[PDB]
Design a protein around this ligand. Structure first.
Ligand SMILES: CC(=O)c1ccc(-c2sc(NC(=O)NCCC(=O)NC(C)(C)C)nc2C)cc1
Length: 801
C-alpha cells in the first residue's frame, strides 16, 4: 500500500534497507526498530510545535567579555524590514516586537531560515552573538510564524563455557589457527586456541574449546571474539554471548568474518560481513572503618592521574577495596569501573549495589570529559554507560550540537543496537531541528561507508526519520537528490581529466543540463538555502583530485547581499577525518570562550557523504599562503604586501594584522595539541581580512607553522609578536585545563576515524605537558615557538620534491 511507498522513501533517504534480513543471525535490529517506537512518539507528542517549527538557536551561557567590549553603549541595534531600533541586551523578542508596534508576527533572520523567538534575551541568541563577534548588523524581517501543521508526523549453571569450532571456509587465497576470546569492554577474561592446521579453502576442527569461566559468570555485553591467525591476524568476527533478551546464546552459527588491512572501532562490531561471496566464514556451535592517611594519599594520587595513565594491579586492588571511598570523587569513576572483574558474577553484583547509592555522582556538576570516558570502548556494562548518558541528559541543545558528532561516533562502542545513548540522540534530534539535521547527516555519512556499523546507524536513522516530520522529510529528500546529482558530476569530470578545454566545456555543459532541484538546504549550514547554479562561476579546481568548484544563488529573496554560496565537491579525500578535526576545533573554540578568549578559528563546514567523497564550504575572500608567495616570486615580505594590497584603509590593514595574530596563535596552539602543526604552506589559507586557517586535514621537522613570512607580518622582537607569544600561552594553558576531555576526544577520534595503537594517542598527552606546572608548560610552548623560528623555511622548501 501507500504505507509501503513511505518505507521505500525512507530507504531512499537512508541509503540502506532496514527491512532487509539478509545479514542477520538474530532479530536484534528489528527488536531495536520496535523498541525505538516508544521514545520516538514520546518525544514527538511532548515537543512544542511552535518552538519546534521555528527552532530558535539559543544558549544559556553568559555573553563573553570580548563581546561586551563591542557594545559600549548597552544598545544593540536591530534593523527591521525598514528602520533601526535601539534595544537592550536583555530585551526579549516579545518585548522587542511589542515595543516596535507601540501582534502575532515574528522576527526571522534576513536570508535565512532562522528565528529569534522564545523567552530568551537577544543577548542569548547565537545569530546575534555571531553578528556581534563579526561586527555585522542584525537584520530581520517581520514574517508570519511557520505553520506547525507542517511538522505533522505520519502516525505509526556452574558448567564452564564451551564453544564448538567446526571450521573455516574461504574460496580465496602457510598455517592457520583459531583464537576464541571472551571480551568485555576490550578486557579479555579468558582465551583459548585451536591446533595449527594447513591453511586451505576448508579447515575443519570439530573441536570443543573449554574456557576457564563459568556460565553464570558471563556478564551482559560480553563478546565471543573469534579470530584467525596465519604469526599474523587475518580475520575477525564477534558474537554477543548474551543477546538483547538476556538469553544465553545457543545454536549453530555461520559467521562471515571481516578481513584485516596491512585497536579501532570496527574490530568491535557485532555485525558480520555482508559480502558472503568472497568473505571468510567461521562455523561454530553453542550448547549450554575508614582509610589511613598514606593509603588515602596513594588513592587520591591514583584518581588524580590522566585517562591514559594505565592502572596497575595494586592500583585496581586499592580502588576496589576502597570503592565506597572512591565513589565520593566523580573523577575516579572511569578508573573505578575499570578495576572491576567483570568475569565474576558476585563482583558485578557488588558493583551494581555500589551504583545503587550514587548521590555524589548525581549531584556532581556535568563533566563532559568524564562522561566521554564512560561512553568509550573500555566500558561494556550498560549501567556504567547509562550513568554517563544520564549526565549527558542535562546538556542544553547548544552543547549537544557541540558534541553531536562524537556522541554519534561513540554509538559504535555500544554493545547492543538499542542503547541509552542511541535513545538519547533520538530524543535530542527529534526535540530540535538543528540537532536533527546534523544527526541525519552524521548517521548518513557512517551508513554510506561503514559496513561494520551501517545496520545499527540505519536503524537509528529510520527511527529518527519516522518522527522528524513531513516537512523535514521533504528537506532531506531534496538535499539527498542534489548531492547525488553533484557527486555523479564530480566522478565523471574526475574520470575525464592540469585542466583541459574539453574539461571546462564538459563541466559547464553538464551543469547546464543538470539544472533542467529548485532549491535545497545547505547540508553544512542548515540555515542557508541554495537555489539556481551560477554556472559561469563553476569550474574544476585543477587539484590532483579534480574537485568541483560550484557556486549557487541564495534562494531567499529576503537575503540582503548578492554573494553566492560556494561549495567544493571532492572525491579522493576521506572527509570523515576532516569532520572530526573541525568539530574538535569548534570544541577548542568553546573551551577558549569559557575563559573570554577568541582566537578567531575558521572551522569551515564540511560533510562526508560517501566513501572518500564529500562537500566543503567556501569561506569568503580567502587564498593560500603558498599562492601569495608564488604570485610575487621564499620571500618573507610578501604576506604583508598582499595584506596592504587587499585592505583599502590603513585602519582595515591594522585590523587585519590583529585578526591575523589572533587566528595564527589559535591555529598554532590547536595544530600543536592535535599533532597536525607541521603543514605545507599550500594547506594554510588566509582571508582578505587577515584571518588565517588550515585546510584539508585528511590523511594527515617542526612543531607547527610560524614561518618568517608570518613573523614579518608580525615584525621581527616586536610589540605584536609579544601579543602573539602571550595569546599562545594563554590558550595553551586554557586547553591544558581541559586536558582530560581533549585526550578522551583525541583517542575516540583515532579509534573511530583513523586507520591506531597505543603509541599514537600519547602524543596529545605529551603535547599537553601532562603532570607539569603551568609555568613550565608556558616555557615549553615558548621553546616550540623558538624552534619554529630557528627552522625557517627548511621544511617548507624540502616538501617541494
Ligand atoms: C584542497 C581542498 O579540498 C579545499 C581547498 C580550499 C577550500 C576552501 S576555499 C574557501 N574560501 C574561498 O575560496 N573564498 C573565495 C571565493 C568566494 O568568493 N566564495 C563565495 C562566492 C563567497 C562563496 N574556504 C575553504 C575551506 C576547501 C577545500
Amino acid at each position: 500500500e501507500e504505507s509501503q511507498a513511505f518505507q521505500r522513501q525512507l530507504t531512499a533517504l537512508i541509503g540502506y534497507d532496514v527491512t532487509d534480513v539478509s545479514n542477520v543471525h538474530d532479530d536484534e535490529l528489528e527488536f531495536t526498530r520496535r523498541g525505538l517506537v516508544t521514545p520516538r512518539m514520546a518525544e514527538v507528542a511532548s515537543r512544542d510545535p511552535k518552538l519546534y517549527a521555528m527552532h530558535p538557536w539559543v544558549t544559556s551561557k553568559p555573553l563573553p567579555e570580548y563581546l561586551w567590549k563591542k557594545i559600549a553603549n548597552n544598545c544593540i541595534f536591530i534593523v527591521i524590514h525598514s528602520q533601526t531600533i535601539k534595544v537592550s541586551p536583555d530585551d526579549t523578542p516579545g518585548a522587542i516586537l511589542q515595543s516596535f508596534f507601540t501582534q502575532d508576527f515574528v522576527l526571522r533572520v534576513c536570508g535565512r531560515d532562522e528565528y529569534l523567538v522564545g523567552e530568551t534575551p537577544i543577548k542569548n541568541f547565537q545569530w546575534v552573538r555571531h553578528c556581534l563577534k563579526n561586527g555585522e548588523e542584525i537584520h530581520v524581517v517581520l514574517d508570519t510564524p511557520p505553520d506547525p501543521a507542517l511538522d505533522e508526523v505520519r502516525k505509526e549453571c556452574d558448567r564452564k563455557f564451551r564453544v564448538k569450532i567446526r571450521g573455516i571456509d574461504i574460496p580465496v587465497l602457510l598455517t592457520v589457527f583459531v583464537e576464541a576470546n571472551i571480551q568485555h569492554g576490550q578486557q579479555v577474561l579468558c582465551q583459548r586456541r585451536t591446533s595449527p592446521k594447513p591453511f586451505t579453502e576448508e579447515v575443519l576442527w570439530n573441536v570443543w574449546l573449554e574456557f576457564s569461566i563459568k556460565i553464570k559468570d558471563l556478564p551482559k555485553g560480553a563478546l565471543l571474539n573469534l579470530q584467525i591467525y596465519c604469526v599474523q591476524l587475518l580475520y575477525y568476527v564477534n558474537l554477543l554471548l548474551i543477546d538483547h533478551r538476556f538469553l544465553l546464546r545457543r545454536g549453530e552459527y555461520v559467521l562471515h568474518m571481516w578481513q584485516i588491512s596491512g585497536f579501532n572501532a570496527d574490530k568491535l562490531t557485532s555485525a558480520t560481513n555482508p559480502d558472503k561471496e568472497n568473505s571468510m566464514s567461521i562455523s561454530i556451535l553453542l550448547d549450554n572503618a575508614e582509610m589511613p592517611n598514606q593509603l588515602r594519599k596513594q588513592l587520591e594520587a591514583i584518581i588524580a592521574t590522566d585517562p591514559l595513565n594505565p592502572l596497575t594491579a595494586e592500583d585496581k586492588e586499592l580502588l576496589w577495596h576502597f570503592r565506597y571511598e572512591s565513589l565520593k570523587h566523580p573523577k575516579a569513576y572511569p578508573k573505578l569501573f575499570s578495576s572491576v572483574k567483570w568475569g565474576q558474577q558476585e563482583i558485578v553484583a557488588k558493583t551494581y549495589q555500589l551504583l545503587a547509592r550514587r548521590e555524589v555522582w548525581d549531584q556532581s556538576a556535568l563533566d563532559v570529559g568524564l562522561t566521554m570516558q564512560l561512553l568509550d570502548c573500555n566500558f561494556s556494562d550498560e549501567n556504567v554507560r547509562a550513568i554517563a548518558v544520564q549526565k549527558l541528559e542535562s546538556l542544553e541543545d547548544d552543547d549537544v550540537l557541540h558534541y553531536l558528532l562524537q556522541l554519534v561516533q561513540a554509538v559504535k562502542f555500544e554493545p547492543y543496537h538499542d542503547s541509552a545513548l542511541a535513545r538519547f540522540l533520538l530524543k535530542r534530534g527529534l526535540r530540535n531541528k538543528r540537532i536533527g539535521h546534523f544527526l541525519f547527516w552524521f548517521l548518513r555519512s557512517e551508513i554510506a561507508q561503514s559496513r561494520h556499523y551501517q545496520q545499527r546507524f540505519a536503524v537509528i536513522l529510520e527511527a529518527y526519520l519516522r518522527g522528524c516530520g513531513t516537512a523535514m522529510l521533504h528537506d532531506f529528500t531534496q538535499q539527498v537528490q542534489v548531492i547525488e546529482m553533484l557527486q555523479k558530476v564530480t566522478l565523471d569530470i574526475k574520470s575525464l581529466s592540469d585542466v583541459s578545454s574539453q574539461v571546462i566545456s564538459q563541466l559547464k555543459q553538464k551543469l547546464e543540463n543538470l539544472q533542467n532541484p529548485e532549491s535545497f538546504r545547505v547540508p553544512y549550514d542548515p540555515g542557508l538555502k541554495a537555489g539556481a547554479l551560477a554556472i559561469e562561476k563553476c569550474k574544476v579546481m585543477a587539484s590532483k583530485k579534480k574537485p568541483l568548484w560550484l557556486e549557487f544563488k541564495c534562494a531567499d529573496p529576503t537575503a540582503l547581499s548578492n554573494e553566492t554560496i560556494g561549495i567544493i565537491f571532492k572525491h579522493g579525500d576521506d572527509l570523515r577525518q576532516d569532520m572530526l578535526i573541525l568539530q574538535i576545533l569548534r570544541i577548542m573554540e568553546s573551551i577558549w570562550e569559557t575563559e573570554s578568549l577568541d582566537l578567531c578559528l575558521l572551522p569551515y563546514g564540511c560533510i562526508s557523504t560517501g566513501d572518500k567523497i564529500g562537500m566543503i564550504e567556501i569561506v569568503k575572500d580567502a587564498t593560500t599562503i603558498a599562492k601569495i608567495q608564488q604570485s610575487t616570486v621564499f620571500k618573507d615580505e610578501v604576506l604583508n604586501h598582499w595584506l596592504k594590497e587587499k585592505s583599502p584603509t590603513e585602519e582595515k590593514f591594522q585590523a587585519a594584522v590583529e585578526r591575523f595574530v589572533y587566528s595564527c596563535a589559535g591555529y598554532c596552539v590547536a595544530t600543536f595539541v592535535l599533532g597536525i602543526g607541521d603543514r605545507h604552506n599550500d594547506n594554510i589559507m588566509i582571508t582578505e581580512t587577515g584571518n588565517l586557517f588550515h585546510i584539508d586535514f585528511g590523511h594527515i621537522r617542526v612543531p607547527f607553522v610560524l614561518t618568517p613570512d608570518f613573523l614579518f607580518v608580525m615584525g621581527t622582537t616586536s610589540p605584536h609578536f609579544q601579543k602573539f607569544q602571550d595569546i599562545c600561552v594563554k590558550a595553551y594553558l586554557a586547553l591544558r585545563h581541559h586536558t582530560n576531555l581533549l585526550i578522551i576526544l583525541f583517542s575516540m577520534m583515532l579509534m573511530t576515524g583513523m586507520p591506531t595503537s597505543k603509541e599514537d594517542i600519547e602524543y596529545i598527552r605529551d603535547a599537553l605537558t601532562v603532570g607539569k606546572n603551568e609555568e613550565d608548560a608556558k616555557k615549553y610552548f615558548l621553546d616550540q615557538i623558538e624552534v619554529c623560528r630557528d627552522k625557517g623555511w627548511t621544511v617548507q622548501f624540502n616538501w617541494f620534491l
